[PDB]
Each structure stands twice: as structure tokens, then as C-alpha cells.
């Protein structure tokens, strides 16, 4: 019931924690046979006119998009904003908001670990690869550890230091699910709940009353087909999915080598991905 053909619409670059260039991606996501690819990095749409050039000059079909962390009564829940209005002001506003509160933990947690751990500032920035327009985060202070020999993996040093149980994790705020929600589909976009079966990060999953108060506030779909939800999960979101008819997405959640997901190993139907593109925004000029 996962795809075996479509879209990969959950990838990483460089543009926040991701290891490859938007080229890198489209020209990758081609010659996998994928039938095309969405750029989905953190808080921002940096990469969205990189990933633009690259998706004409390779010929591979591009889903505009963006991975917004958000926060549901004590639930940290990830959302998958695609083709949206860019310089809509509202999501601007928040994605700055967000990114701002996100380099001030991220600071404070670099100046923690400096006092067990051989890491800087410098160092952690040695991680991130396009400057202003990187969306710096935890997985930067992760490869920081990991290029001065602390952890042989990014994903070692979130097991330990980097861990949300460390006593050097601090928790970024977020803006709520429903305000995101609100953001997404006032700048014309699609939104789909990302993972929402993933019992990693949380101590718990979201509710199914929680995910109806997300359907009431205009939630489009949910990632169902990505590694981090169990089979009973995919039944469960299936179930939720089919009843409120919502879509159905899967996505590789790639960083590249940032993590072990390979990318296209999970997939959304094409189908679907066209039905995102009708929801949202004409976004071909732009
Ligand atoms: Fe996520
Ligand atoms: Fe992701
Ligand atoms: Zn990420």
C-alpha cells in the first residue's frame, strides 16, 4: 500500500539540516526514477528558487514546500507546508520568529556543552553550509560533535548530549498547530501532519481528538508512509485519513547523510501529489 513509484516529498538540504544542495536533490531524486521531489526544509523556503532552476534544467518535477515544527498541548508535531505564497507576510513573520528563537537555544545549548565537550560556536557554524540562510538547529551542533570526535554519527549524538533528556537540551518555543495551520492555508498553501505516528522526540502521539481539532482548522492531509511510523500507526492514520478524506503522503525525511533514510524509500502517490498542487498555489513565475 506504499507507493511503489511517485514523489518524494520530505527532503533536507543544506538550506537548514540536510547535507546536499537543491541540485544535488532534484539531480539525485531523477536518476532514483522518481517521478519528482519536494524540498522541505525547516522554517524557510531559502532553497525554493534553487530547487526551481534545478528541477528545469534536469527536467524533474518540484514540490515547493517547508517542515514547520509546531507544538499541540504537549505534543512537538512536525507540518508539511507545500505551495504556498512565499513572501506571504503572516508565515514570513513566523518562519523569522521561529528561526530567531531557534539560533538563541542553539547558542545557549553550544555554550552548555562547551563546558564538557571540545565545541565552539565557530565550530557549530563550520556545520552550516549556506551562511544567513541556513536554518541553524540541534543537527549543527550534532555534526559539530561528530567532526570533533566525540560521536561517530549525528544520530549518536542525539541518543546522548544533543538528547532531549540531556541536561544541555534546551526546548525551542513553536507556534501551535493551529496557527500554523492557519498560516499555511491563509498563504494559499497545502499542510499535512508529518510523522505523526513517531514515538521518538515525544513522550507521546498526538490523539485522535487532537488531529480532529487539526482537520476542523483546515489540515489537508498525513504522512503515513515514512520510516518513524509503525504499522500500527499506519492503520490507525490510514483509518483517520479515509474517514475525514484527508491525503496520503510518505516522504524519505533525507538529510542526505545527515541520517540513514535513503532518499525515495518512502513515497507519495502521484495521485495525491496532484491533488496538492490543485489546492495550492500557482506558483509557476514565482
Ligand atoms: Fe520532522
Ligand atoms: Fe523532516
Ligand atoms: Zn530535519
Given at each position: 500500500?506504499?507507493?511503489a513509484?511517485?514523489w518524494?516529498?520530505?527532503?533536507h538540504?543544506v538550506?537548514?539540516?540536510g547535507?546536499?544542495?537543491?541540485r544535488?536533490?532534484?539531480?539525485?531524486a531523477?536518476?532514483?526514477?522518481?517521478?519528482?521531489?519536494?524540498?522541505?526544509?525547516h522554517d524557510?523556503?531559502?532553497?525554493?528558487?534553487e530547487?526551481?532552476?534545478?528541477?528545469?534544467e534536469?527536467?524533474?518535477?518540484?514540490?515547493?514546500?517547508?517542515?514547520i515544527?509546531?507544538?499541540?498541548?504537549?505534543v512537538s508535531?512536525?507540518?508539511?507546508?507545500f505551495?504556498?505564497?512565499?513572501?506571504?507576510?503572516?508565515?514570513?513573520?513566523?518562519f523569522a520568529?521561529?528561526?530567531?528563537?531557534?539560533?538563541?537555544?542553539?547558542?545557549?545549548?553550544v555554550?552548555?556543552?562547551?563546558?564538557?565537550?571540545?565545541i565552539?560556536?565557530?565550530?557549530?557554524?563550520?556545520?552550516?553550509k549556506?551562511?544567513?540562510?541556513?536554518?541553524?538547529?540541534?543537527?549543527?551542533?550534532?555534526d559539530?560533535?561528530?567532526?570533533?570526535?566525540?560521536?561517530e554519527?549525528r544520530?549518536?549524538a542525539?541518543?546522548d548530549?544533543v538528547?532531549?533528556?540531556?541536561?544541555?537540551?534546551?526546548?525551542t518555543?513553536?507556534?501551535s498547530?493551529?496557527?500554523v495551520?492557519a498560516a499555511?492555508k491563509?498563504?494559499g498553501?497545502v499542510?499535512?501532519?508529518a510523522?505523526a505516528g513517531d514515538?521518538?522526540r515525544?513522550?507521546?502521539l498526538?490523539?485522535?481528538?487532537?488531529?480532529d481539532?487539526?482537520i476542523?482548522d483546515?489540515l489537508?492531509?498525513?504522512?503515513?508512509?515514512?520510516?518513524?511510523?509503525?504499522?500500527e500507526?499506519?492503520?490507525?492514520?490510514?483509518?483517520?485519513?479515509?474517514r475525514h478524506?484527508?491525503?496520503?503522503t510518505?516522504?524519505?525525511?533525507?538529510?542526505?547523510?545527515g541520517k540513514?533514510?535513503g532518499?525515495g524509500?518512502?513515497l507519495?502517490?502521484?495521485?495525491?501529489?496532484?491533488?496538492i498542487l490543485?489546492?495550492?498555489?500557482?506558483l509557476?513565475?514565482?
Amino acid at each position: 500500500e506504499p507507493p511503489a513509484q511517485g514523489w518524494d516529498i520530505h527532503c533536507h538540504t543544506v538550506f537548514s539540516d540536510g547535507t546536499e544542495t537543491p541540485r544535488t536533490l532534484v539531480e539525485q531524486a531523477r536518476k532514483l526514477g522518481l517521478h519528482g521531489v519536494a524540498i522541505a526544509d525547516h522554517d524557510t523556503t531559502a532553497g525554493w528558487d534553487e530547487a526551481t532552476e534545478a528541477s528545469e534544467e534536469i527536467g524533474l518535477p518540484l514540490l515547493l514546500g517547508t517542515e514547520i515544527t509546531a507544538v499541540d498541548e504537549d505534543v512537538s508535531v512536525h507540518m508539511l507546508a507545500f505551495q504556498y505564497d512565499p513572501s506571504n507576510e503572516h508565515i514570513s513573520s513566523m518562519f523569522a520568529n521561529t528561526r530567531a528563537a531557534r539560533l538563541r537555544r542553539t547558542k545557549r545549548m553550544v555554550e552548555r556543552l562547551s563546558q564538557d565537550f571540545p565545541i565552539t560556536w565557530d565550530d557549530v557554524l563550520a556545520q552550516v553550509k549556506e551562511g544567513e540562510r541556513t536554518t541553524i538547529g540541534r543537527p549543527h551542533i550534532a555534526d559539530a560533535l561528530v567532526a570533533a570526535g566525540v560521536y561517530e554519527t549525528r544520530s549518536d549524538a542525539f541518543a546522548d548530549a544533543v538528547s532531549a533528556k540531556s541536561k544541555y537540551y534546551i526546548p525551542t518555543p513553536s507556534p501551535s498547530t493551529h496557527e500554523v495551520i492557519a498560516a499555511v492555508k491563509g498563504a494559499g498553501g497545502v499542510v499535512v501532519a508529518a510523522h505523526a505516528g513517531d514515538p521518538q522526540r515525544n513522550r507521546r502521539l498526538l490523539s485522535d481528538e487532537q488531529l480532529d481539532a487539526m482537520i476542523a482548522d483546515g489540515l489537508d492531509g498525513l504522512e503515513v508512509w515514512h520510516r518513524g511510523n509503525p504499522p500500527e500507526q499506519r492503520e490507525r492514520l490510514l483509518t483517520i485519513a479515509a474517514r475525514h478524506d484527508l491525503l496520503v503522503t510518505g516522504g524519505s525525511d533525507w538529510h542526505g547523510k545527515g541520517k540513514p533514510n535513503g532518499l525515495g524509500e518512502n513515497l507519495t502517490d502521484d495521485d495525491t501529489v496532484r491533488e496538492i498542487l490543485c489546492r495550492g498555489v500557482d506558483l509557476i513565475g514565482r
